[PDB]
Design a protein around this ligand. Structure first.
Ligand SMILES: *[C@H](O)[C@H](C[C@@H]1CCNC1=O)NC(=O)[C@H](CC(C)C)NC(=O)OCC1CCC(F)(F)CC1
Ligand SMILES: *[C@H](O)[C@H](C[C@@H]1CCNC1=O)NC(=O)[C@H](CC(C)C)NC(=O)OCC1CCC(F)(F)CC1
Lengths: 298, 302
């Protein structure tokens, strides 16, 4: 089961930010609201926006920030890469313990999808190898955030900025740097060739074994390098020795050596699944990490 | 592709989760106003689990036997009663985080969010579909009982599920918040069989409407059917028969696409009888049955 983190600590931070006729979401931590800087653009700016030039011309009173029924007074603003930081006169009392992190491709995070500053859904996503995410984001979702929770600390890793023509999504970390080669201008942008997160597929196969599903296993083994040759042929990410180590606990628990599971996955890539399904799925799932699988077995 | 299982934000429910302990048995409870709701089998020992005498077990209990805690803070119990398979513990403090709420009993095919909890602490949130045999495919471990399933409409939380047990096949069973089990199950430590599962027809039809909304409509044909005729055919392919309520909840998607429900039923009947023929719908040769008409509207139209 693809499981998201409980979203309560993040819901208490979502606000609505408006400039002119553009409305999106902001993240209110302490006395600062973070949001995508493209809220300051008009239609006639969106194609090549000189954001520093646009921002020096804005006044504090041009930003309308609403937390529920309350308006928050903006008392200063600055820009950090693609994120606007609005200083407000009030501290958010619901601010959790938090940090800002930049996640690696193949890592997963929960998305709290918001519209008009109101949370609407929560779901799990992975940072794709090509630095897109396969999200569910509609108009007005910008400023929705992705996060992980460790103990009582919320680690914010993603803020939503745009959709690509293929229907996948792109955004930044909370320092405002995009993941991937994307730019916050209103243009049709393609991503690099995506690849499949091999260590995650292996984690998921182990999960299927842990739940009594093992039709895809076989008697064979493979070397790491020979596996990686076939993996790259099928546009799967290479498996590193650190990946093999990370899979150690699932390997121990199931009694199935990592390179044995690699030989199972090699068979599935070359032979297909031929009708069969694994954990309900007709496709190999690659948005469960080893940690995710273990968190949900313990 | 295009669609994913999306849960409701869990914060309003997180603010109601507590733990309820009898002896060394700890499970989760739901604290709303000055009442805590939880599975009655918290009052059981292992010697009593094969066929507990819940009525006698409850007479032996007093208020001071129940440890209710929000985090590490004890909530004093001032009354107790049993309603079907749920224990209702009156407490001396009204939960200040109580949302607007209602208790609803859902129908098979309906989806809901589960906030999986252990020792009163949330671990994760995910969407579940109530199968036609009244089981769900949850991710529940020991200590998860009392976790709840819910939907959120406006600012109102509709609680529909409380978790009680696992079946030999690995699926899960539970009650509504009035303590009435979904399906033929009972809260005893015994092996119980779920009915053979079937495919959720109304959700498959929702999925076909979703495909049409997205411009994927090769499968629409020029014919219609009666509901009875479709139901008789559908049963032969292990699809659930449609109810009048199912026809009604497809109303909004029917109006959005202009395709009458019974016309879509005729298109589905042809897929069942003739198969996909190596074709796909929304990228898959498999028909999805875990997205309700409401789920589809939420993700197509927001
Ligand atoms: C912010 O709410 C919004 C979110 C997207 C709208 C629909 N789904 C989304 O995720 N973001 C934007 O509108 C950006 C703003 C730019 C200044 C970055 N633009 C955008 O996402 O454009 C969408 C594509 C659609 C296809 C296309 F070819 F026309 C090019 C742009
Ligand atoms: C409450 O936390 C717990 C939840 C289950 C533990 C593991 N996964 C779960 O969903 N519920 C129980 O332990 C119930 C208690 C009874 C009084 C209802 N018992 C139970 O779920 O038993 C599981 C079955 C498994 C198949 C079997 F044949 F072995 C018979 C017992």
């Amino acid at each position: 089961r693809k499981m998201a983190f409980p979203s309560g600590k993040v819901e208490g931070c979502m606000v609505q930010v408006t400039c002119g006729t553009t409305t999106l979401n902001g993240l209110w931590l302490d006395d600062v609201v973070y949001c995508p800087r493209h809220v300051i653009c008009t239609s006639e700016d969106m194609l090549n926006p000189n954001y520093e030039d646009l921002l020096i011309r804005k006044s504090n009173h041009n930003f309308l920030v609403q937390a529920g029924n309350v308006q928050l007074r903006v008392i200063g603003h600055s820009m950090q890469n693609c994120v606007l930081k609005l200083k407000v006169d009030t501290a958010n009392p619901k601010t959790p313990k938090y940090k800002f992190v930049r996640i690696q491709p193949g890592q997963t995070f929960s998305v709290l999808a918001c519209y008009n500053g109101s949370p609407s859904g929560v779901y799990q996503c992975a940072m794709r190898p090509n630095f897109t995410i396969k999200g569910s984001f509609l108009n007005g979702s910008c400023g929705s955030v992705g996060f992980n929770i460790d103990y009582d600390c919320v680690s914010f890793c993603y803020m939503h900025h745009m959709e690509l023509p293929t229907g996948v999504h792109a955004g930044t970390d909370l320092e405002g740097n995009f993941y991937g080669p994307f730019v916050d201008r209103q243009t049709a942008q393609a991503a690099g060739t995506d690849t499949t997160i091999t260590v995650n597929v292996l984690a998921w196969l182990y999960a299927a074994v842990i739940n009594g599903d093992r039709w895809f296993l076989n008697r064979f083994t493979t070397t790491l390098n020979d596996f990686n040759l076939v993996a790259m042929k099928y546009n799967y990410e290479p498996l590193t020795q650190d990946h093999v180590d990370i899979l150690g606990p699932l390997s121990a628990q199931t009694g199935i050596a990592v390179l044995d599971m690699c030989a199972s996955l090699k068979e599935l890539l070359q032979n297909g699944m031929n009708g069969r399904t694994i954990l309900g799925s007709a496709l190999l799932e690659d948005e469960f990490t080893p940690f995710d699988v273990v968190r949900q077995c313990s």
